Design a protein around this ligand. Structure first.
Ligand SMILES: C[C@]12CC[C@@H]3c4ccc(O)cc4CC[C@H]3[C@@H]1CC[C@@H]2O
Ligand SMILES: C[C@]12CC[C@@H]3c4ccc(O)cc4CC[C@H]3[C@@H]1CC[C@@H]2O
Lengths: 225, 11, 231, 11
């Protein structure tokens, strides 16, 4: 709002949720672990959202809408970030580092694993920075449900300013700044795609009683159909 | 109320 | 190719633009779910033929292997149909101009089960375009970005260089239009974030079309069957 | 090959 670029970055960095652990595999047990983790992460996600500058200035109705829309995108970009320095693997948790082929343990999962791994590869290629990552995650929260207004578009502009500030600080030329900004935002289209796909997969797992899902996770899934 | 709605206010 | 200046890029894309096609709308009868789906998919099929030939004129596209050309179009085709629709509809608040003889509002969308939700998203995007005062030159840049980007992380550098050139071109357009330096990066971001929404709409639309197929509501062309199958 | 693969070659 009246934050400076560095203030915005520090605030987003401070607001970061913790990295959670799993338990120290059939379809049922892997889906169990992943959905148990997701549920626990969601509780921290809600707290993080309240610390994204501008978010609590929104109505409760809007806060609910944005989180219900964005939650899987947000879990996924977190996963991809965690996984960046682990080529070919997904670091769901520090004690749950899954190779690409372990995705085959759940029907329909390997295709989603491949999309996530490709995203992690793309971040690695771009040398995505932590400060850029937290900007992107906030943009996902504020953007993904916003057409379904002006104060939010102002906050979104401020985060764009913050990304550009980071790139200028890194020594990028004007041309390089705009190109990199575009590269980063285009990855959000891919994160949306993966979330759409992941949502259908979870739904399908829900229908099959493959796995007990928490009330919270059921309500978050439910918002999408 | 969904869980979310309360949690969003819980201090 | 990478050699194009910004003005050459804009001119290439404007030249490559497909025509606005007409639908087979029959005003002698009311709609049914089947006939409305028939109209929309008949239209899509004919637009797809123009889309294939348009894609070949997008800088860098025909240099790709035929397999990669197939992949990019299979991934992006409904996004591309939708951004075209939203663009056509900008100066028609509350309506979707599928064709000059097929201008539908959300109440007509209710004629197809599950469709009004998608109509509402498309109308909202059209409103967003309107409020932003999206320019034709920006629109053709965005549409080419969708073609090259949507399938690119299903597989590289070549595509990324063309994508960077389109970014340069968008900034050039905004600068030429008198936007301040800060306004340029803010608007670039606003435009590109709408591509997230267009992806979302395409995914919902793809699931809807699949449902229609799977309920034998409408016969689909071989092309649409295979496009739909790719997903 | 897919229909599109052929259709892409018609010049
Ligand atoms: C939602 C799924 C389970 C939970 C998974 C998860 C769980 C935790 C996390 O941090 C990220 C992700 C992303 C992929 C998600 C999966 C994709 C499909 C599956 O149903
Ligand atoms: C794919 C659908 C049929 C074809 C429709 C169409 C048809 C032509 C066109 O130019 C755009 C669109 C977007 C909405 C599409 C619809 C969304 C759901 C429906 O099944």
């Amino acid at each position: 709002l009246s934050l400076t670029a560095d203030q915005m970055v520090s605030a987003l960095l401070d607001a970061e949720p913790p990295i959670l652990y799993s338990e120290y595999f059939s379809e049922a047990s892997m889906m169990g672990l992943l959905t148990n983790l997701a549920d626990r992460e969601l509780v921290h996600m809600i707290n993080w959202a309240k610390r994204v500058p501008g978010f609590v200035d929104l109505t409760l109705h809007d806060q609910v809408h944005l989180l219900e829309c964005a939650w899987l995108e947000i879990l996924m970009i977190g996963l991809v970030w965690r996984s960046m320095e682990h080529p070919g693997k997904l670091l769901f948790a520090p004690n749950l580092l899954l190779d690409r082929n372990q995705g085959k343990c759940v029907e329909g999962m390997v295709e989603i694993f491949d999309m996530l791994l490709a995203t992690s590869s793309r971040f690695r290629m771009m040398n995505l920075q932590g400060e850029e990552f937290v900007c992107l995650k906030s943009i996902i929260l504020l953007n993904s449900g916003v057409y379904t207004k002006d104060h939010i578009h102002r906050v979104l502009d401020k985060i764009t300013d913050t990304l550009i500030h980071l790139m200028a600080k890194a020594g990028l030329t004007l041309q390089q700044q705009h190109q990199r900004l575009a590269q980063l935002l285009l990855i959000l289209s891919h994160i949306r795609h993966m979330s759409n796909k992941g949502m259908e997969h979870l739904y399908s797992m829900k229908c099959k009683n493959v796995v007990p899902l928490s009330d919270l996770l059921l309500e978050m899934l439910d918002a999408h159909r | 109320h969904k869980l979310l709605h309360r949690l969003l206010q819980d201090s």
